[PDB]
Structure formats: structure tokens, C-alpha cells
Amino acid sequence: MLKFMLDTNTCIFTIKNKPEHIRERFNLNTSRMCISSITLMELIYGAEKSLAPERNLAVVEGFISRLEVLDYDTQAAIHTGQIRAELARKGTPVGPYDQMIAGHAGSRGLVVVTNNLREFERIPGIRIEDWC
Amino acid sequence: MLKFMLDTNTCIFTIKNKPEHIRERFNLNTSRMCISSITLMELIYGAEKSLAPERNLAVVEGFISRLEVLDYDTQAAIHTGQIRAELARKGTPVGPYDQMIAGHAGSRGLVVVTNNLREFERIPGIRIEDWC
Amino acid sequence: ITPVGESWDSWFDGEGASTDFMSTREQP
Amino acid sequence: SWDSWFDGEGASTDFMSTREQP
Ligand SMILES: [Ca+2]
Ligand SMILES: [Ca+2]
């Protein structure tokens, strides 16, 4: 069963650094990890805007072909809308992509993997693991 | 067969003003209109943060129940990442949701219907129409 | 029996991204 | 119909009076 949604920052850091602690978690949770298509979009932008687009696209494609990319669907959208509104009212917003990811993970009952605990801590109903 | 993807601006305007000319366009184009789930997120947020949330949710709900809402999927993500890269290359600002909606539409060969032509006009490969 | 993709180690051990790749993320 | 939506319940005047795209 899917259990974990990797935030974009974790993906970038893993791509750039291939860290041991992450590799261990990846292997422990093979087939239980996904990203949101919102993250895919950011990673494709990173690749295409870089000095080595072809090279970097292939690295990304290899990353995403080993996990699941989930569609940002109607329930993701609703739950994201609801969270945004709660955050506005409390004056502690989160960046636009991050809000979507948290809303997506929220709608699917998934744990967000992030090093940005301070930021993500404050999103209602969120479950977090830092794999660094 | 879907032809038009309504941008967030056109949806907000339509909801707030209930304009006669849009009603005629809608009736003529039933079952050829859609929104992105990105726009759904923005409408729910707008409802939920407003001074009459339950009431505004119901208006939003009746609006979206009458057209198709498309999931923002892997092809939408990829098309969006490409577009963001070409816009960066040209130092042209477009907002984050507008970009996703333009990528979404472009991934499905759709015309974007928008009353903010100036923002969308500089996206390469755009097809746009203004219904206001 | 759980379906699995290619191994994670084969990716982690692959040659990676160029140095400039997303040195910044760019979230508005 | 769309007609019944266009003639029905109205949103409050504050609804997304600014869109708030960040
Ligand atoms: Ca992140
Ligand atoms: Ca829009």
C-alpha cells in the first residue's frame, strides 16, 4: 500500500546528493512511495531549465520510474483548498507548491517526507517524516 | 469532445456576476467545457476563506457539477515544466497557477478561455479566447 | 508478491545530475 | 440547467474579490 509522499525538496536533495540515509529508507519502503504530479512538474522544470537538460531529464525519469506519480485529482484539490483557507485565517501560509503537495498527501492519507518540519508542521491534519 | 478549459479568472467572474453573455456561451458549449483541478482548488479556497463559506461552497459546487474537472496528470505536469522553462528563458513572469492551467490545456490540445488575455498571450503555443 | 520496479541502488549508484541542477528551486 | 445556476443562489460580494495567486 502507498504510505509516503516525498516533498519536492526531498526529491531535489536526493537527486543532487544521493544520500545514504535516504537510500536506506527507499529500500525499506520500496513500492510504498509516491510523488504528486505537482512535484513532477517542478523536477521537469529543473531539468529543462538546466545547463544539461537531456542528462538531467534522464536522471529524473529514472527516479520517477521507480516509484509512483499520483495525479492531482479532485479530492487533492478540495483538500488543498480547505487547508489553504485554514492557513490564511491563521496567518501562516506555506508556498504554493508545498500547499498542493500537503493537500494531495492529505487527501490520500499519506505521510509527507520533508526536511521542512517548521513549515509543514503547521498544516492541519498532516503527518510528517524527515528522512535526512 | 472537450474544446475549452476555463481559467480561474473566467470562473470567478462568472460566479460573481452571473453574466448573460457567458450563460449563452455555456449553453451553446455544454459538454465541451472543462476546468483543471488546479482551478477547482482555487475556487474551494475562495469559498472556504470567504465570509459566507457554506453558501459560497454551494455556489462553487453547483458550478463545477455542471462541467468536467480534469485531473492534473503526468502529461499536464510535463507540459507545464516545459513551458516554465521556455518562459524563464525569455524572463516573462506568469503566475504559478496560470502556468499550470496553460500546461494542462496544452497537454490536452484545449483552448484556454480567459478574461485576462495579457497574462496568457505570452505563453508559447497558447490558444486563447475571451468570453467577456 | 509485490510488483517492484528497477532497483533503487541501480539508480542511486547511477551517474547523477549536473552540478547546476536546481541549485535553487524557485517557488514564488 | 445552467439557467437555474445563473438564476439561483448568489455568492457573497466578498467571494474572491481578489484572487490571491502567489
Ligand atoms: Ca518541499
Ligand atoms: Ca486562471
Side-chain angles (χ1 to χ4, degrees), chain D residues 2-15:
Chain D
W2 279 109
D3 289 10
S4 77
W5 182 83
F6 274 76
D7 293 346
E9 199 167 9
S12 61
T13 55
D14 62 301
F15 175 76

Side-chain angles (χ1 to χ4, degrees), chain A residues 11-12 15 18 35 39-48 53-67 69, chain B residues 78, chain C residues 8 11 15-17 21-22:
Chain A
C11 296
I12 297 165
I15 284 157
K18 316 284 188 75
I35 60 162
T39 294
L40 174 56
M41 173 281 288
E42 301 198 70
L43 298 176
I44 297 297
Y45 170 61
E48 298 273 24
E54 160 181 298
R55 180 184 180 181
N56 290 328
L57 279 172
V59 169
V60 169
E61 278 287 310
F63 180 92
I64 72 187
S65 67
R66 283 165 170 85
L67 44 59
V69 185
Chain B
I78 287 169
Chain C
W8 277 115
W11 187 82
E15 200 156 41
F21 173 81
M22 287 183 106

Side-chain angles (χ1 to χ4, degrees), chain A residues 6-115:
Chain A
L6 314 177
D7 89 329
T8 296
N9 278 357
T10 298
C11 296
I12 297 165
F13 188 93
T14 301
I15 284 157
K16 291 175 68 59
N17 300 115
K18 316 284 188 75
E20 181 52 24
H21 293 160
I22 301 299
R23 189 188 68 79
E24 289 156 6
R25 294 297 194 142
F26 278 34
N27 284 324
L28 193 67
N29 297 295
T30 296
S31 318
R32 307 163 65 201
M33 295 177 304
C34 66
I35 60 162
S36 177
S37 61
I38 299 305
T39 294
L40 174 56
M41 173 281 288
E42 301 198 70
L43 298 176
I44 297 297
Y45 170 61
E48 298 273 24
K49 71 154 158 149
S50 75
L51 281 167
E54 160 181 298
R55 180 184 180 181
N56 290 328
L57 279 172
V59 169
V60 169
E61 278 287 310
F63 180 92
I64 72 187
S65 67
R66 283 165 170 85
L67 44 59
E68 292 208 8
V69 185
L70 300 187
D71 289 355
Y72 188 84
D73 60 12
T74 279
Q75 296 78 38
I78 294 181
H79 192 87
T80 301
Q82 290 167 343
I83 280 173
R84 269 258 280 283
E86 298 173 79
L87 291 181
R89 295 182 337 250
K90 312 320 157 313
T92 63
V94 154
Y97 298 140
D98 287 347
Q99 286 182 328
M100 292 180 85
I101 286 150
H104 199 167
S107 66
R108 293 291 295 236
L110 295 174
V111 181
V112 180
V113 176
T114 176
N115 185 231

Side-chain angles (χ1 to χ4, degrees), chain B residues 6-12 38-39 42 97-99 101-102 112-116 119-120, chain D residues 19 21:
Chain B
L6 315 186
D7 93 317
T8 301
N9 284 312
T10 300
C11 304
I12 294 171
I38 302 312
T39 292
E42 297 198 74
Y97 304 136
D98 290 336
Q99 288 171 347
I101 296 162
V112 178
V113 177
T114 176
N115 60 8
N116 174 15
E119 174 99 323
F120 280 92
Chain D
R19 166 181 176 183
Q21 180 172 221

